[PDB]
Write a protein that binds this ligand. Structure first.
Ligand SMILES: [Mg+2]
Ligand SMILES: [Mg+2]
Ligand SMILES: [Mg+2]
Ligand SMILES: [Mg+2]
Ligand SMILES: [Mg+2]
Ligand SMILES: [Mg+2]
Ligand SMILES: [Mg+2]
Ligand SMILES: [Mg+2]
Ligand SMILES: [Mg+2]
Ligand SMILES: [Mg+2]
Ligand SMILES: [Mg+2]
Ligand SMILES: [Mg+2]
Ligand SMILES: [Mg+2]
Ligand SMILES: [Mg+2]
Ligand SMILES: [Mg+2]
Ligand SMILES: [Mg+2]
Ligand SMILES: [Mg+2]
Ligand SMILES: [Mg+2]
Ligand SMILES: [Mg+2]
Ligand SMILES: [Mg+2]
Ligand SMILES: [Mg+2]
Ligand SMILES: [Mg+2]
Ligand SMILES: [Mg+2]
Ligand SMILES: [Mg+2]
Ligand SMILES: [Mg+2]
Ligand SMILES: [Mg+2]
Ligand SMILES: [Mg+2]
Ligand SMILES: [Mg+2]
Ligand SMILES: [Mg+2]
Ligand SMILES: [Zn+2]
Lengths: 208, 124, 99, 85, 138, 104
RNA sequence: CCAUGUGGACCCGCCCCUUGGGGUGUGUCCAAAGGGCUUUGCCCGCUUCCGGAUGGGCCCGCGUCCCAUCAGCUAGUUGGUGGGGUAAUGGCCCACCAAGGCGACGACGGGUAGCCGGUCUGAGAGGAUGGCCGGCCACAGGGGCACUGAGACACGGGCCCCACUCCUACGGGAGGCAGCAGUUAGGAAUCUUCCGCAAUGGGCGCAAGCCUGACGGAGCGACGCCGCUUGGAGGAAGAAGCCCUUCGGGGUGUAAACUCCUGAACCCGGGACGAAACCCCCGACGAGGGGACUGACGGUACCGGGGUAAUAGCGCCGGCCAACUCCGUGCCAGCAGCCGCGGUAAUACGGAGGGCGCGAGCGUUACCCGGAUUCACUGGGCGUAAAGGGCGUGUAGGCGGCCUGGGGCGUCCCAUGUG
C-alpha cells in the first residue's frame, strides 16, 4: 500500500523539515524542531562522508517521501517525464502537482498530505463535478477540484477552509473559499515550487 | 585484421558454458541422497562443512552442500537442488534448499529465514 | 460412429464407380480409334473418333475430366489420327477433322 | 465469397468493433483486405460510428455480402440510400 | 607500391605541420586540387600553389597555424587538429544525405565526392545529394 | 520485369543447354566493403547459336528442365576467354587442397 | 440417349501479337431440373459462355545458424528428342540417345531449430528470442496409398503393414484429444469434466430456425503489470517494557496510550450499456418508415442511504552497497556473488536492540541482453604481456600512379508501386 508509520523522523532522516506531520509541523513540536539528528542508537554520533551514490539517493528519497507516494510509481512518473518532450527535472514535478492527493493539499482542503489523501480516497472530492477516489489522478489545466456538498459541513474541511483567509494559494490556482471550489490554472514552473530538493541530483540516480 | 581478412574469415561469436550442468534447463532438481558426509575445506580455511552426494532425476550423481546449522539428511531422504557454488570446497557447485521434501527447515532462526525454509515464530 | 460422415463415403463409392465406367470406357474406345487409324481405314477411324470425342465432352460436362483435361485428350487423339492417316490414305469422312 | 463484417478489437466487457472486407472462410480478426470504418457498440463517444460510403459502394458493385448486423450498420451509414425522382 | 593518392596528402600535411613547416608539396592530381580549394575556402590552410618540382607536376600547399602560444611549449595549434580519411580503399563509404554526418558538433568539416563534386557537409546537404565520404578536418 | 542477367558462358559441353556466369557487386551486409559474388545459370539456347566464352543477357522464364529457368536474350559481345580461363583456374585448383594429396 | 445450340472445346487453315495470347474460315462434339407461393408472374434454383472479385497452385531474382577434427559429391545424377501425367511448366514420371551437373564465393556429410510481424536487452551497431494475438509452413501414434470433389492426397473420411491398447466362441474385429475439459505419466512447474450461443464469426435454410468446447464470459493460480485498504487530524522535553551507556545519560519515539475525525468490509433499496438486426405490415420485392422477439456476464458494474479503526510481510546492514553496537561463539559452529571474516575485544557467523531498502509482495535458483571497446563495422591488438607464419615463389582473390573522352554496373538524387 502506502507508507504508514512514524512520519516526523524523516522530518529528520534527510536532515530538513518535511511538512508531512502537517499543522503540528509548524510548532516547536514537529519532531525535527526538537532533535535535528535522524533516528536510531547512533543518530547523534559523528557522520562521515556520504558516498557519491549516498547523496545521489538521499535527495531522491526526500522527493519521494516528501510527496507521499511509494517508489514503484515514483518511477513510472519519472520514466514518464523522460519519455516526454521538454526539461526532465521540470516536467517531473509538473506531474506531481497534477496528482489528486497533492492537488488538494495545495488547494487548502487539508492539514497534511497524508490527511489530504483520506479525503480523496473516501468519496469526498469533486473533479469537473464528479466523485474521485483516486490519488493516482491526472489533473489537467482547467480542471475543477471542489468538494461534494455532502461532506462540506464537516469540521476537518471547514477549520481548514477557515485558515485560508490568512494564506494564499499557489499562482497556478484560484481558491473559491466560500463556494468551496478550486481551479487548476496551468501546470507549475520550477519558478514556483521552492522545495528542499535539488532535482538533477534525483535524475543522476535514475541514470545509474 | 584487414577488412577483407574478416570478410573472408570473420568474428567468431563467443560461446557460453553453464557453470551448472545437472539441471537440464531446470532451476531445481529433486534427487535421492546417496552419501551423507562432511569434507574438510580448501586452503586458508578450516571447518568440517556438511555435504551430500545425490543421485538425480536428470541421470546424474552430483554432490551438494547442506546450508545451515542442523540437518535431517539420511541416505534416502528426497531433496531439492539449486545453483550457487562454494569457494571453500571443490566439486560442490549446487546447494540443497532447506525445507522442501524430506529436508529440514532450521529451527532457531529469526533473521535470514525465507532461504532457510523456517516460518514465523511469534508468540515469542 | 458419425452418420454425417459415413454418408459421403458411400457417396464416393458410387461416383468412383461411375467415374471408372466413364474413363475406362474412353481408354478402350480411343485405343480402338488409334487402332483403326494405323492402317488407313479413314472411313472407320474417323467414325470412332467422333464417338470418342463426344464421350469425352460428356465426361467434361461432368466431374471426371476437366475442360482443361478433356480438351487435352481431344488433341491427343484428333491430331494423332490426322497423322497416322499420313502414312496411308486420305480422309474419307472428314468427320472429326477440319481440312 | 467476399464478405463485409465485424472484427473485435477491444477486450473484456470493452468491445470495439471494426468494419472489414474479408474472404468468407477467413478467421474473424484476421488479415482483412480493407478497413472501411469502425463501430462502437458500447457507444461511449460522439464518434461511435464511422463508415465512409464510397468504398462499400465499390465493394458491392464488387459483390461482397454483408452480415445482418453489418448490413444494418451500413443502411444507417447512408450506404444504401437513393435520391432525385 | 603506392596505393592511396588521397590519404597520402593528409599525412604529408599531417606530418608537415606537427613540425611546424611553413610549406609542403604534394603530387599534382585533379582530386588533390579540388579537395585543396575546400581546405582554404574553409581556412585550414593558407592555400595551394601549382609548382613544378624537378620538371614534374606538383602542388605546393602552404601551412596554416595557431599564433605564438606561451608557456614552456611555445608551439601553436594546427588549424588542422586532426585530419583523416574515411572511405578507405577496399572498404568504401557512401552516404546519402540522410546518412551525411556532421563533424565536431558543427565546428568541423566532412569532405564529400558527389555527383556535383567536391563538397562539405554544409555545401553537401544545402545541395541535397551525397556520395563517397572522404575525410574529416577540425 | 522477368529479371535480366548479364553473364559470360563457361560451359558448352551439353545439348541445347549452356552454363552462364553472372556476377554482382555490393557492400558487405555488416563489414561493408564492396564485395562481388557470382553464380552460374543453366540457360536455354535452342538453335545452339552462342558458344563457349560469349557475353550474354538472360531472362527468367518458363521452366525447361530441372535446372533450366532462363532463356537467352541476346549477345553483348563474343570472345572473352580471359574469365573462362580464370573460372577454369578456380575449377582446376580443387585438384590441390585435398586430403587425398597433391604431388610435385 | 436424342434435338436446338446464343456460345464454348479440340483438329487443320490464314491474320494480328509473340513461349500455349486475340480474332476469323470448314468439319466435329457438349447443354439443363424442376420446387415454392402473394398463380397468366414474382421468388430459390437450372444449363452453356465472356468478365469482375476472391482465394490459391507453380517458377525465378536477393535474404536465410554452426563444425573443414566432413573435401570432394553425383547415375534419374545433368542435359536432349518422343511420351505419359496434372488445372498448369518441369526428371515430376517412363522409354531411348549424348556425358553431363555441383563444389572452398563451402558442394557433401554431421549437429541444431519451424520461419516472420514483433518481443526482451542496448547510446547506437549488434547480441537474445519467435508460447499468447496475427501472416505463411508442416504434420494428426510410426509409414505408404488413392478415392470423392472447385479444392485435400483430408485430425474427430477411406484401403494396407508395424508398434501399442482392447472385445473374442481363437475364424476375427474394434481404437487414435497435439479440438475444450479432465485422468494418468513425467517432472522444480502449468488450471474447471463451469454458464451461454444473448454478442460476433461460420456452415445450411425463402424463412422461423438448426449445429457452433470458434467464441462471449465465469471459475481456479499474486504468475505478471497497473488501480486500492490496513487510517488520518492531535498528542510528552518524551510512559512502561525491550537495547546501548563513560551510570550523568543516549535510542526505539508523537510511535504507542487516550482526545477528536473519516468509514474498506458488511446491511437496505434501486439497477445497465453492451441490442438491433434477420423476421413482420406499410411502401415496389428497392430507397425510406412503423411494430415485435432476445442478455450466458448478473441481480455483477455503477447510483442513493446505512455503517465498524479495520491484513504486514521479506532481503540487507565489512568493501562494491543505502545501514552500527552489545552479548554469545573462539579457524569451532558457520557465512559467502568477488577479494574474504572466525585460532576469547568478530560493524562478516547465530540472537537482540537499533538501521537501510522495499511493500502484498520481498527474496533465492535458472535463462536473455547490458556491463565486456573480453569477437573489437561503430570500437582492439602481436618486440618482452596470449599472438609475425623458420625463409622464398607464385595461383585463386583483395588492392593500385598521371592526362581526356565514351558507357552509367556501383554510389548519390527526384517522382512512383510496395512495405
Ligand atoms: Mg458508500
Ligand atoms: Mg476427380
Ligand atoms: Mg446434342
Ligand atoms: Mg445432371
Ligand atoms: Mg425426369
Ligand atoms: Mg527440432
Ligand atoms: Mg554497448
Ligand atoms: Mg530464430
Ligand atoms: Mg498464435
Ligand atoms: Mg497422441
Ligand atoms: Mg499418415
Ligand atoms: Mg481427435
Ligand atoms: Mg450468427
Ligand atoms: Mg490479485
Ligand atoms: Mg509464491
Ligand atoms: Mg501495486
Ligand atoms: Mg496517528
Ligand atoms: Mg439501447
Ligand atoms: Mg556503507
Ligand atoms: Mg547473512
Ligand atoms: Mg564479540
Ligand atoms: Mg550479525
Ligand atoms: Mg561486443
Ligand atoms: Mg586488446
Ligand atoms: Mg610472447
Ligand atoms: Mg615463430
Ligand atoms: Mg583506378
Ligand atoms: Mg576519368
Ligand atoms: Mg546507376
Ligand atoms: Zn512532520
Amino acid at each position: 500500500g502506502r507508507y504508514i508509520g512514524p512520519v516526523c523522523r524523516l522530518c529528520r532522516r534527510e536532515g530538513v523539515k518535511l511538512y508531512l506531520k502537517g499543522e503540528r509541523c509548524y510548532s516547536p513540536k514537529c519532531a525535527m524542531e526538537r532533535r535535528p539528528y535522524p533516528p536510531g542508537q547512533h543518530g547523534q554520533k559523528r557522520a562521515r562522508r556520504p558516498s557519491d551514490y549516498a547523496v545521489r539517493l538521499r535527495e531522491k528519497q526526500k522527493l519521494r517521501r516528501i510527496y507521499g507516494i511509494s517508489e514503484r510509481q515514483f518511477r513510472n512518473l519519472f520514466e514518464e517525464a523522460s519519455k516526454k518532450k521538454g526539461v526532465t527535472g521540470s516536467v517531473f514535478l509538473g506531474l506531481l502537482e497534477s496528482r489528486l492527493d497533492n492537488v488538494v493539499y495545495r488547494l487548502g482542503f487539508a492539514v497534511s498530505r497524508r490527511q489530504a489523501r483520506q479525503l480523496v480516497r473516501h468519496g469526498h472530492i469533486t473533479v469537473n463535478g464528479r466523485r474521485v477516489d483516486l490519488p493516482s489522478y491526472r489533473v489537467r489545466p482547467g480542471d475543477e477540484i471542489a468538494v461534494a456538498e455532502k461532506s462540506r459541513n464537516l469540521e476537518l474541511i471547514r477549520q481548514n477552509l477557515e485558515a485560508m483567509k490568512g494564506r494564499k494559494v499557489g499562482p497556478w490556482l484560484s481558491l473559491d473559499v466560500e463556494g468551496m471550489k478550486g481551479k487548476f490554472l496551468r501546470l507549475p514552473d520550477r519558478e514556483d515550487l521552492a522545495l528542499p530538493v535539488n532535482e538533477q541530483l534525483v535524475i543522476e540516480f535514475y541514470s545509474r | 585484421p584487414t577488412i577483407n581478412q574478416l570478410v573472408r574469415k570473420g568474428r567468431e561469436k563467443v560461446r557460453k558454458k553453464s557453470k551448472v550442468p545437472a539441471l537440464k534447463g531446470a532451476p531445481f532438481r529433486r534427487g535421492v541422497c546417496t552419501v551423507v558426509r562432511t569434507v574438510t575445506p580448501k586452503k586458508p580455511n578450516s571447518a568440517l562443512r556438511k555435504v551430500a552426494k545425490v543421485r538425480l532425476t536428470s541421470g546424474y550423481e552430483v554432490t551438494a552442500y547442506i546450508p545451515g546449522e542442523g540437518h535431517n539428511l539420511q541416505e534416502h531422504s528426497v531433496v531439492l537442488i539449486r545453483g550457487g557454488r562454494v569457494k571453500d570446497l571443490p566439486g560442490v557447485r549446487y546447494h540443497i534448499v532447506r525445507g522442501v521434501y524430506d529436508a529440514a527447515g532450521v529451527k532457531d532462526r529469526k533473521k535470514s529465514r525465507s532461504k532457510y525454509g523456517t516460518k514465523k515464530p511469534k508468540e515469542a | 460412429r458419425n452418420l454425417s460422415a459415413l454418408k459421403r463415403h458411400r457417396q464416393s463409392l458410387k461416383r468412383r464407380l461411375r467415374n471408372k465406367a466413364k474413363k475406362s470406357a474412353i481408354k478402350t474406345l480411343s485405343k480402338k480409334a488409334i487402332q483403326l487409324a494405323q492402317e488407313g481405314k479413314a472411313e472407320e477411324a474417323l467414325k470412332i473418333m467422333r464417338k470418342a470425342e463426344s464421350l469425352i465432352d460428356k465426361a467434361a460436362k461432368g466431374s471426371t475430366l476437366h475442360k482443361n483435361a478433356a480438351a487435352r485428350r481431344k488433341s491427343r487423339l484428333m491430331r494423332k489420327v490426322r497423322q497416322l492417316l499420313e502414312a496411308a490414305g486420305a480422309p474419307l469422312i472428314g468427320g472429326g477433322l477440319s481440312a | 465469397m467476399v464478405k463485409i463484417r465485424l472484427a473485435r478489437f477491444g477486450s473484456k466487457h470493452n468491445p470495439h468493433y471494426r468494419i472489414v472486407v474479408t474472404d468468407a472462410r477467413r478467421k474473424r480478426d484476421g488479415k482483412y483486405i480493407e478497413k472501411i470504418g469502425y463501430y462502437d457498440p458500447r457507444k461511449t463517444t460522439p464518434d461511435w460510428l464511422k463508415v465512409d460510403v464510397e468504398r462499400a459502394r465499390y465493394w458491392l458493385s464488387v459483390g461482397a455480402q454483408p452480415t445482418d448486423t453489418a448490413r444494418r450498420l451500413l443502411r444507417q451509414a447512408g450506404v444504401f440510400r437513393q435520391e432525385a425522382r | 607500391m603506392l596505393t592511396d593518392p588521397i590519404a597520402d596528402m593528409l599525412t604529408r600535411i599531417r606530418n608537415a605541420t606537427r613540425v611546424y613547416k611553413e610549406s609542403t608539396d604534394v603530387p599534382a592530381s585533379r582530386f588533390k586540387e579540388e579537395i585543396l580549394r575546400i581546405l582554404a575556402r574553409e581556412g585550414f590552410i593558407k592555400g595551394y600553389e601549382r609548382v613544378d618540382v624537378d620538371g614534374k607536376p606538383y602542388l605546393r600547399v602552404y601551412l596554416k597555424y595557431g599564433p605564438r602560444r606561451q608557456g614552456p611549449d611555445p608551439r601553436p595549434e594546427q588549424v588542422i587538429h586532426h585530419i583523416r580519411r574515411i572511405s578507405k580503399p577496399g572498404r568504401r563509404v557512401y552516404v546519402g544525405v540522410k546518412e551525411i554526418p556532421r563533424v565536431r558538433r558543427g565546428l568541423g568539416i566532412a569532405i564529400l565526392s558527389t555527383s556535383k563534386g567536391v563538397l562539405t557537409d554544409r555545401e553537401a546537404r544545402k545541395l541535397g545529394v551525397g556520395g563517397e565520404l572522404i575525410c574529416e578536418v577540425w | 520485369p522477368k529479371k535480366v542477367l548479364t553473364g559470360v558462358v563457361v560451359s558448352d559441353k551439353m545439348q541445347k543447354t549452356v552454363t552462364v556466369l553472372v556476377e554482382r557487386q555490393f557492400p558487405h551486409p555488416l563489414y561493408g566493403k564492396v564485395i562481388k559474388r557470382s553464380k552460374k545459370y543453366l540457360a536455354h539456347d535452342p538453335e545452339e547459336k552462342y558458344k563457349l566464352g560469349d557475353v550474354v543477357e538472360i531472362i527468367e522464364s518458363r521452366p525447361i528442365s530441372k535446372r533450366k529457368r532462363f532463356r537467352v536474350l541476346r549477345l553483348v559481345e563474343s570472345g572473352r576467354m580471359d574469365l573462362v580461363e580464370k573460372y577454369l583456374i578456380r575449377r582446376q585448383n580443387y585438384e590441390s587442397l585435398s586430403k587425398r594429396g597433391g604431388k610435385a
